């Protein structure tokens, strides 16, 4: 005790980083995060575990100390820094640009996108608050807060941040007929779009949800997160598409990579 921890070992970190076990040593842990716990990932581990644009430790700082990588515009001078859900990190031009959305299994992503559609976020309100001077704001979930939203509608709903300023550009209502995207848990990041508007009133919230292939998987509220509309989706996604293709279908679908 006696203050906050600042050292974090390997074999004590989150496993969904898919970080290595046996290098004989400690692990990266982020700073004081903007948004999440370490269900984010440091941008150190993004570019030598998954990108492999580097191969050892402080050479992540060598790219980082030299104005190269832009995160939401700014260079992000802290070498370890949380790159959580939905966020847009960008390198130099000609298609080195990404976005951080979960897959089905539990890995994070390798999601190569363009400089267009990477000009806007898509967040979620945790709380709305009318702060001082009698003037209302809202608290989106990546740490930011935006002022004067598209008002008098909602709590617990998405929003479309626009990477210049606050900029409510499209709030999209928490609908039954919707495209939702669960964030976390054993059911992390499949897709289940809706089935029903439960509340389980009074005590605690929970939402019934069905997938594309009619396997109803039912999630907590704090995991679940709206991202679009049926057939529409605003943030596009990789080739996984959220099916949870199970192991007795994994067996013969992987019979196409041998070429023989």
């Amino acid at each position: 005790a006696r203050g906050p921890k600042k050292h974090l070992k390997r074999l004590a970190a989150p496993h969904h980083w898919l970080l290595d076990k046996l290098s004989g040593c400690y692990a990266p842990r982020p700073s004081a995060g903007p948004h999440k716990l370490r269900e984010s990932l440091p941008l150190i581990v993004f570019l030598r575990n998954r990108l492999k644009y580097a191969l050892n430790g402080r050479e992540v700082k060598a790219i980082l100390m030299q104005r190269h990588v832009k995160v939401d515009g700014k260079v992000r001078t802290d070498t370890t820094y949380p790159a959580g859900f939905m966020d847009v990190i960008t390198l130099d031009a000609t298609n080195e640009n990404f976005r951080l959305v979960y897959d089905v299994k539990g890995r994070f992503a390798v999601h190569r996108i363009t400089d267009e559609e990477a000009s806007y976020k898509l967040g979620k309100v945790k709380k709305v608050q009318l702060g001082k001077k009698g003037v209302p704001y809202v608290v989106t979930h990546d740490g930011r807060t935006i002022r004067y939203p598209d008002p008098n509608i909602k709590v617990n709903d998405t929003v479309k941040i626009d990477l210049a300023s606050g900029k409510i550009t499209d709030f999209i209502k928490f609908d039954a007929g919707k495209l939702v995207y669960v964030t976390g848990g054993r059911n992390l990041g499949r897709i289940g779009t809706i089935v029903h508007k439960e509340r389980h009133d009074g005590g605690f919230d929970l939402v019934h949800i069905k997938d594309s292939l009619d396997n109803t998987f039912v999630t907590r509220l704090n995991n679940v997160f709206v991202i679009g509309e049926q057939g529409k989706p605003y943030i596009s996604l990789p080739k996984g598409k959220g099916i949870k293709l199970s192991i007795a279908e994994e067996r013969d679908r992987r019979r196409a990579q041998q070429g023989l």
Binding site: R10, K21, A248, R251
Partner: protein
């Protein structure tokens, strides 16, 4: 410090010191293959233990079962990949009824003598 690293045993001795045939039925085998040590005859039985550790519990459960139709279809393939189970008996029940000391004649002591070359398996 450093994260731990696992290490296991790979055999299991019988609970009987002295029986007047199995200390010769090993040597009905020991000259039959040219094996230098009965650690290995415990070692290959350790697979024959742990195969039938892995196979009886897949069969006391039911037909159409999400480990039996995955792993009971997968466990038979890895041992016919060596080929010790025959190319007709894929039904996982001649895995429980697998032949006694059948894994070790496709060790390449006697896979290089079946292509001539030695005129022994002690030479192997």
């Amino acid at each position: 410090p450093r994260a731990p690293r696992t290490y296991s045993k790979t055999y299991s001795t019988p609970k009987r010191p002295y029986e007047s045939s199995r200390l010769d039925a090993e040597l009905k085998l020991a000259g039959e293959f040219g094996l230098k040590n009965k650690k290995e005859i415990y070692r290959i039985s350790f697979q024959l233990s742990k195969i039938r550790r892995a196979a009886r519990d897949l069969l006391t459960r039911d037909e159409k079962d999400p480990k039996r139709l995955f792993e009971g279809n997968a466990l038979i393939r890895r041992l016919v990949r060596v080929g010790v189970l025959s190319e007709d008996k894929k039904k996982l029940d001649y895995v429980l009824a697998l032949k006694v000391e059948d894994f070790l004649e496709r060790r390449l002591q006697t896979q290089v003598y079946k292509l001539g070359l030695a005129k022994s398996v002690h030479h192997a």
